[PDB]
Design an enzyme around this catalytic site. Sequence first.
Site, PDB file in Angstrom:
ATOM      1  N   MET A  71      12.025  -6.306  -6.247  1.00  0.00           N
ATOM      2  CA  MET A  71      11.170  -5.381  -5.486  1.00  0.00           C
ATOM      3  C   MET A  71      11.872  -4.058  -5.173  1.00  0.00           C
ATOM      4  O   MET A  71      11.675  -3.473  -4.108  1.00  0.00           O
ATOM      5  CB  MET A  71      10.653  -6.039  -4.197  1.00  0.00           C
ATOM      6  CG  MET A  71       9.734  -7.226  -4.438  1.00  0.00           C
ATOM      7  SD  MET A  71       8.212  -6.755  -5.287  1.00  0.00           S
ATOM      8  CE  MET A  71       7.336  -5.903  -3.979  1.00  0.00           C
ATOM      9  N   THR A  94      11.291  -1.305  -2.592  1.00  0.00           N
ATOM     10  CA  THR A  94      10.108  -0.407  -2.459  1.00  0.00           C
ATOM     11  C   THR A  94      10.555   1.051  -2.405  1.00  0.00           C
ATOM     12  O   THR A  94      11.283   1.456  -1.499  1.00  0.00           O
ATOM     13  CB  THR A  94       9.284  -0.731  -1.196  1.00  0.00           C
ATOM     14  OG1 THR A  94       8.925  -2.120  -1.198  1.00  0.00           O
ATOM     15  CG2 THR A  94       8.014   0.112  -1.137  1.00  0.00           C
ATOM     16  N   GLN A  95      10.097   1.826  -3.383  1.00  0.00           N
ATOM     17  CA  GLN A  95      10.480   3.218  -3.539  1.00  0.00           C
ATOM     18  C   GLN A  95       9.247   4.115  -3.509  1.00  0.00           C
ATOM     19  O   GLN A  95       8.111   3.639  -3.505  1.00  0.00           O
ATOM     20  CB  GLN A  95      11.180   3.412  -4.891  1.00  0.00           C
ATOM     21  CG  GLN A  95      12.610   2.906  -4.963  1.00  0.00           C
ATOM     22  CD  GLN A  95      13.399   3.523  -6.115  1.00  0.00           C
ATOM     23  OE1 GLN A  95      13.132   4.653  -6.548  1.00  0.00           O
ATOM     24  NE2 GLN A  95      14.388   2.784  -6.610  1.00  0.00           N
ATOM     25  N   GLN A 151       2.510   1.701  -1.827  1.00  0.00           N
ATOM     26  CA  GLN A 151       3.456   0.543  -1.873  1.00  0.00           C
ATOM     27  C   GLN A 151       3.574   0.027  -3.310  1.00  0.00           C
ATOM     28  O   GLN A 151       2.580  -0.030  -4.039  1.00  0.00           O
ATOM     29  CB  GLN A 151       2.991  -0.578  -0.924  1.00  0.00           C
ATOM     30  CG  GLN A 151       4.117  -1.351  -0.243  1.00  0.00           C
ATOM     31  CD  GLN A 151       4.444  -2.670  -0.927  1.00  0.00           C
ATOM     32  OE1 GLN A 151       3.764  -3.675  -0.709  1.00  0.00           O
ATOM     33  NE2 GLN A 151       5.500  -2.681  -1.737  1.00  0.00           N
ATOM     34  N   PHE A 152       4.792  -0.330  -3.713  1.00  0.00           N
ATOM     35  CA  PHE A 152       5.059  -0.811  -5.072  1.00  0.00           C
ATOM     36  C   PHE A 152       4.375  -2.154  -5.341  1.00  0.00           C
ATOM     37  O   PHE A 152       4.540  -3.111  -4.580  1.00  0.00           O
ATOM     38  CB  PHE A 152       6.568  -0.929  -5.315  1.00  0.00           C
ATOM     39  CG  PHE A 152       6.926  -1.590  -6.618  1.00  0.00           C
ATOM     40  CD1 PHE A 152       6.562  -1.010  -7.828  1.00  0.00           C
ATOM     41  CD2 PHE A 152       7.630  -2.787  -6.638  1.00  0.00           C
ATOM     42  CE1 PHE A 152       6.887  -1.616  -9.031  1.00  0.00           C
ATOM     43  CE2 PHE A 152       7.958  -3.396  -7.838  1.00  0.00           C
ATOM     44  CZ  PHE A 152       7.587  -2.809  -9.036  1.00  0.00           C
TER      45      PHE A 152
END
Lengths: 125, 196, 222, 233, 222, 204, 195, 195, 212
Positions: D107, D1-2, C1-2
């Site tokens: 994000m 989110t990637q 997750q980023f």
Amino acid sequence: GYDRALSIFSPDGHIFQVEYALEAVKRGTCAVGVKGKNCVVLGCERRSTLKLQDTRITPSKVSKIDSHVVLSFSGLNADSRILIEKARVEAQSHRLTLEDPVTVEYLTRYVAGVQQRYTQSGGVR
Amino acid sequence: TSIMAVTFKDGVILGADSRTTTGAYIANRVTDKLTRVHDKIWCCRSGSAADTQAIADIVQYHLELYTSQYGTPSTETAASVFKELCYENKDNLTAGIIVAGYDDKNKGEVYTIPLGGSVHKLPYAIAGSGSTFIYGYCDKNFRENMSKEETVDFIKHSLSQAIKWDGSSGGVIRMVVLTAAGVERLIFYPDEYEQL
Amino acid sequence: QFNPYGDNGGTILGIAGEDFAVLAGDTRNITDYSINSRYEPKVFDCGDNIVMSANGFAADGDALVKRFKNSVKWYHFDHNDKKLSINSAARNIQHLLYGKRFFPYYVHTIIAGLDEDGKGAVYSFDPVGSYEREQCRAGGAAASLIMPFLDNQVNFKNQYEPGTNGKVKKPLKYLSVEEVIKLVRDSFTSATERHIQVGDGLEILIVTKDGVRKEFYELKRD
Amino acid sequence: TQQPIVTGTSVISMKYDNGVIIAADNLGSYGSLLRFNGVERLIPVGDNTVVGISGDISDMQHIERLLKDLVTENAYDNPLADAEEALEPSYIFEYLATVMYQRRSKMNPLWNAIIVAGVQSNGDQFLRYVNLLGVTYSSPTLATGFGAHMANPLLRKVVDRESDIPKTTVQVAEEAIVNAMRVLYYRDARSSRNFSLAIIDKNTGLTFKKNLQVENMKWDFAKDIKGYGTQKI
Amino acid sequence: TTIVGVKFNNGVVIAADTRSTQGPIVADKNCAKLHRISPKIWCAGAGTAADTEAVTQLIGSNIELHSLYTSREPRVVSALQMLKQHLFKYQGHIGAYLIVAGVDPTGSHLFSIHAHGSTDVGYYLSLGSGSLAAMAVLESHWKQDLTKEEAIKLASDAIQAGIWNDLGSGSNVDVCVMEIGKDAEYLRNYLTPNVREEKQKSYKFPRGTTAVLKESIVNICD
Amino acid sequence: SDPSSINGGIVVAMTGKDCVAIACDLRLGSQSLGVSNKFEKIFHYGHVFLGITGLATDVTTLNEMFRYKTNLYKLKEERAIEPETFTQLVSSSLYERRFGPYFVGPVVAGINSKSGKPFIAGFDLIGCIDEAKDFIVSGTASDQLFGMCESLYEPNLEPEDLFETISQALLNAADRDALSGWGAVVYIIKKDEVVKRYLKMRQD
Amino acid sequence: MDIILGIRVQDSVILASSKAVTRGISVLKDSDDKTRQLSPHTLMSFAGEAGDTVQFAEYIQANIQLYSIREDYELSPQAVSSFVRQELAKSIRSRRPYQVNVLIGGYDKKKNKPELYQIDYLGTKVELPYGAHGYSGFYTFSLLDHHYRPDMTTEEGLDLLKLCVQELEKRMPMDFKGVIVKIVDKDGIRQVDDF
Amino acid sequence: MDIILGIRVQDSVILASSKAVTRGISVLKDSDDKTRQLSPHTLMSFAGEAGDTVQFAEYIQANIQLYSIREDYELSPQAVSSFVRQELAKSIRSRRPYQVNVLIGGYDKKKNKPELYQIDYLGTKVELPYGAHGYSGFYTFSLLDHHYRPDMTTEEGLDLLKLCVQELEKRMPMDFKGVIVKIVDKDGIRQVDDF
Amino acid sequence: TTTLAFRFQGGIIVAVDSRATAGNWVASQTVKKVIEINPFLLGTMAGGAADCQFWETWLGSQCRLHELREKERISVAAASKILSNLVYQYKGAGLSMGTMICGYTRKEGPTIYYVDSDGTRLKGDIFCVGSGQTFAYGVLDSNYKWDLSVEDALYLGKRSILAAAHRNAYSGGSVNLYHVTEDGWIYHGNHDVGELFWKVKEEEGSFNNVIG
Ligand SMILES: *[C@@](C)(CO)[C@](*)(O)[C@H](CC(C)C)NC(=O)[C@H](Cc1ccccc1)NC(=O)[C@H](CC(C)C)NC(=O)[C@H](CCc1ccccc1)NC(=O)CN1CCOCC1
Ligand SMILES: *[C@@](C)(CO)[C@](*)(O)[C@H](CC(C)C)NC(=O)[C@H](Cc1ccccc1)NC(=O)[C@H](CC(C)C)NC(=O)[C@H](CCc1ccccc1)NC(=O)CN1CCOCC1
Ligand SMILES: *[C@@](C)(CO)[C@](*)(O)[C@H](CC(C)C)NC(=O)[C@H](Cc1ccccc1)NC(=O)[C@H](CC(C)C)NC(=O)[C@H](CCc1ccccc1)NC(=O)CN1CCOCC1
Ligand SMILES: [Cl-]
Ligand SMILES: [Mg+2]
Ligand SMILES: [Mg+2]
């Protein structure tokens, strides 16, 4: 939404829509307020061209805004209901946030502020 | 890893790249994945470097003790010892091993032992992460009873492609030739195999 | 997750004198065990005799400084070139920080300058905008190393007058700009020795009524 | 989110006396699969800037389009578009740095590490880094990914501080960059032998070199290495 | 940590930095990472500090008993085999990453061992957090047929690369040279390029500064 | 639920000219609750001094364990254990519990009776020896102590001066840590005399 | 199990322990004695995990009584507290530790001094002038810091203890159904019946 | 917030509500009135999540008072309870629901009958002779099943209520600091000061 | 934090500590936990420093706008409800605030309102808020009477904070005292625990647990 500026200034510096609203008040049945030493009395005229009326159910001229404040009026009857409703809501809202009922001055200032807002808002008279 | 073993007319040849990785870092670019468990029984190691070394060391010990008592073990016997270790400890091992040996009776033999610890005797075998990219090529180009030079070219071209596409494979191409003549080590450098 | 945050390391230090104030900070910028730059300044002159540093996550730090600098510019436009006092700057910064209360700037902010009586002033902020004026503050990775030393040497904490039976405290007094710079340099060399994210160089910004002066010193590069 | 899919590895760069050098290999990896081999990861903007990009290639191509559109937009109603009001490296970088940080703040980042190398109008060298987090920094040598771990140490032996820059020639600087690319080929499992190199000089301008190869490699010692400990054969 | 090993003409040399960390804090600025297994077999250790010391002492002890039992000088492959089988048995939980080197009747040797029990052979090796910085130098400057003085230079340069560029490594460079036919020479603090500069101020307190509540003589005698 | 920071506490040791100093705070708490202000963390076996920070039950257990071992040592060896030897004993004992360790930060301090050399050493919870010329720190305010010691310390301090330096290091470090303080003790150790001083500090 | 308090005064140790035994939303008992006599001049109160508390207390009791018979001699409170601590110190690294916190109030006949020891389930021992386990301490410690004096009598100690119970009855969320109070002095152990 | 009880008898509705307000290990207040007068003959008690309880009660109060002024007329308890239920029924599918449980005790002047409604935070309404929210019901319902009669007087209802509070004070784990009792009948709402 | 405020014969006493923590790290010993909203209104701060500091200064702005619009000072009830209604809007968002709004007006007299971040608003005579609230309660309750003198009430408030400062690790620094009367609030100084503890120990004869 309907946006038209209905209340506007004229060359002589008058807002005719506000002044014509006063003419509607001048047409309305007479209402009188007299305050004594320990009381206030609100007197109201009812025109007698209307017989066969049912006075039980007919909207009374004097309206309670809260248990301690009353409001009478002269002019358009339908218009008055809107001001009375807004005032009654504000009265309960004041009790909710301030934990104290409105002063008569505050309630007046609110109702007067609503009336003013309709003199420089688009799409309303 | 990219590894393979190929039987041919005179015996068998083992082949391997020389790359050892930790993630995307190359911890060793000149690794020797072709290891001796007996004079003419060798193996190709893929998977965990620690596990495959530990296994090979134990197998070498077992075959040395076998030789002291019963003489030279068969390639099948060596594959059985590998299997026994890989199968019975399958929960704690990550080892893909190809066993290759030369008997005089049985000639060149290749056994592959995947993760589960199953045994598969084959004419040739490929394994390791880079093997996926050469299934098509190896199946189309492999022939039985090839010559030494043909088998060397087959392994060289095959591992060259595996190395080209697999990031987890690279470095030099090592080879070990198992025949009646003896044991021969071969090495091939990038400048040669890359431009094949 | 980023993960939208990072740790760029480094440490900062603000000390206030009688008619001056200093804001120091090391010039090392890092991520994990790697050095990104040996000279990346994070102490800035923001105008109106206000110096500022927002240490921690450098992206948030740069964004905040950038927004405050812009806030100073518009304060001049909207209020007839009036000088932004250090106390007004501090309150403004609180609102910048608290504006992102639910997605905070991951920084420890310190500003320094002179108050409206011409006396040295240092303000320090937590990531979400709680602030306080102090004589002394260290911020960042080595704050836990430097701060207790500052309590002892700047505010004379735990120091009593010799022979008074631990009854009379060592009296508080303002330090000279010379003595303050000695404490800053010794603080940063000590922090460099024992903290891996601190080193390379030390940049000090000194603020007086005359303006903003700079001084640079080498630190160990290991 | 990637999550990044098709990726590019290290971008390395350094300053020298008259300008800057930047380099990056031509690989587009797909996890452990070395999928694409003709990928150009150095993108020139005008005749004075080169943007080196690593990380997600789909996002790299998006950034290419933005830079391409930036040149077009700058030319609009601009008689001095090829002179005083031409795009500077500092303008291009700040634009990208703004975008990178805005995207991380929503994000939804551009999954990249970027190095903007160039020469300003006044002759000053420009070299600055920005990544998916919006983090920015500048240094005499800059590198991304494995390059940060392996190239920087080698490049810093040439230019260890600001004062070493005037003492470093383009010949010495390029030699170090080419050496660093070889070391990365030895040790980075997601690198390729083929790479591109760009030099932006204040005198000779932009020199873009394609189809370079790592060469003069040491592999001969591998033949002597047998087994993993005891084994003699 | 940064540790390296480099083979040369008539032997092998190993080297190491001297930083010991505890999170981001430098716990020991001059710890010894070069360990003696036997007189002519030495070991450079990275990873969990206690594990590297414990595992190297245990195998060193068993090597000594083995040497006395067999009436022979110990071999590097014996230390290698004992270390890897011990480490493998503990499945990586003993976090010892070692570069094992030495000379014996068979010749000169250089190996590395990882925590999970895998071993590698090479002419040049590097382990630890600064191994990439060190390996970059080794890959750039290493060649076949190094002399003693060239190998020491290459090894110390590789450690320096870690010292300067890796935050996990720092301080000094230790070296041990193991040449065939000669005694091994342990060069403690071979380079010391990180000497602390003179402090700006002496913080020697006036006697009586600290407030005391009680005094008493302690009895250490019987 | 972090064993090393439930009870709180700190220990610091320093060397001087022909002397050593070891000091500790007196707090024992249960997280936020302060429970005891008499909990000393420094013990001694003959002339060798041992300070122990961390989980209080293990502080007590290890003291009792090293008293046990040093007593048997003395009976068999017919002499008092030395700091260098004791340091190895501590390391061995801690590493014996490698995969179920005592949650402690011990610190050895003392003067070798034969050579007269000042000696200090520190350990992690699994027994790694950290030897030092200058100082050793341990406990919940170890960061603070590192900062104080690194700036305040200088070599070859006289016992009376060394006392001031170590005390100020401990006090100011403890005041920046919530779980440390509540009183302090300082041991000044010379070749054949030892002075023990209780420090006045803020009690919050 | 919840509230156990201890106060050491001039010539005695006073232990106060709550009477409530609660399981779920039901107070099953309101007259529970959360203590065991380990020896004629040593008393131990306890609180913690259900089952463990009594099982541990009685196990210690049996061991101390065994010692008394073997040596025809009463162990000192210090000796008993050290024994108890070691048992808990063993327990915490067992497969299933005793989750029990104890106070040991005793009168040392050789020293002619009262002694109060506080030991938690980890084996953390401290000698104190006054002690408490659980949330009780969060109120009583500060209260005793203010009102406690070392030279107080047993009667003064009981009034000091009443002040603690009143505060707990005012501010504690749970109804702990009052306390059983016991005094340990030179004449042994006795219970205060009217509290 | 914890204990709220309701008992409808012959000529009145009696509500009993606990006085304790607890947060953590501290009883912050022991004189809290957990009720609001919605109209002269309608009273609502409440219990549940902190903040939500009062915010919801006063919101309802404002709405009922607004209605009374507009129509110059008092809504029936049935009408008020239906309004309250709908608000809670809306709330349970909101982003953040009101976690509030209520009892509405009212005297219908048109029917000349007392009425007790139990409504939970889900908007589950029931008219009952006696009601309770939370763990209280687990004791009081069975007790009232036995002792309650439909023709009881207000005084008999108060004695019946005392029997509930005594049982709760005996068996409930938490100290709820007694109850405030209010009676709703033909003459409106009044509070019993001595309970 | 430890804060308290109690009502008595001579008005209201308000007492707070000055410590601020970030975990076990003592970040400050000189924080102002009392906000002076107006000459008759005070606010105490406990919990999230920024949350308390920001929103209580915002409260002061709202109280000022009230007296401009209504030409009258805001009631303590109305002031506290502005804050309670505000934090209620943020309920579930993660605000951490334990506050007390203390003041005097003609219609209300001396009044204290407890207001916290999960929406609780309570009128009362005695409150202690913060992690050290229990330690303050122990001393305060056991010595509290309505008929305390201004001098004794000031001391009890100070002594109660000192008690919590001593026992609770996350409280300390110094004690700030306030006294609220019909004429407004009166500041009664900053008292450092460093000197106050020993002064109280010696003069009172308390704190016998500590080594004198
Ligand atoms: C190719 C690469 C893939 O098929 C080959 O098979 C080669 C085989 C040679 C070595 C015989 N395999 C490897 O290089 C092998 C790949 C691998 C990695 C992990 C599990 C299985 C296979 N690499 C290794 O074994 C390295 C050897 C070190 C670098 C000398 N070891 C690791 O990476 C260890 C292994 C831990 C482990 C995991 C699972 C099962 C057994 C062991 N892992 C790490 O060190 C983790 N690494 C450490 C730093 O933090 C990032 C991750
Ligand atoms: C470079 C510097 C780092 O990569 C080198 O590798 C050196 C190797 C040399 C010194 C042999 N490694 C270290 O310095 C090493 C780094 C490290 C840290 C943690 C885990 C693995 C590696 N440092 C240590 O091992 C220190 C040594 C002390 C400071 C002298 N030890 C600790 O940090 C211990 C960790 C112990 C541990 C236990 C179980 C598994 C792994 C590690 N930590 C503590 O003491 C923290 N704690 C504080 C409160 O009281 C209880 C202990
Ligand atoms: C006593 C001390 C018990 O807390 C009092 O209640 C005082 C109240 C006064 C100051 C108003 N409270 C605190 O000190 C309070 C405790 C706390 C911490 C975190 C959340 C809630 C309560 N402390 C803080 O708020 C500190 C104050 C700073 C140190 C001046 N701030 C932080 O811990 C901040 C920001 C917290 C935060 C809240 C909401 C969203 C994001 C963050 N955090 C950091 O500074 C982070 N960190 C600290 C260590 O260094 C690296 C950065
Ligand atoms: Cl291998
Ligand atoms: Mg370094
Ligand atoms: Mg405290």
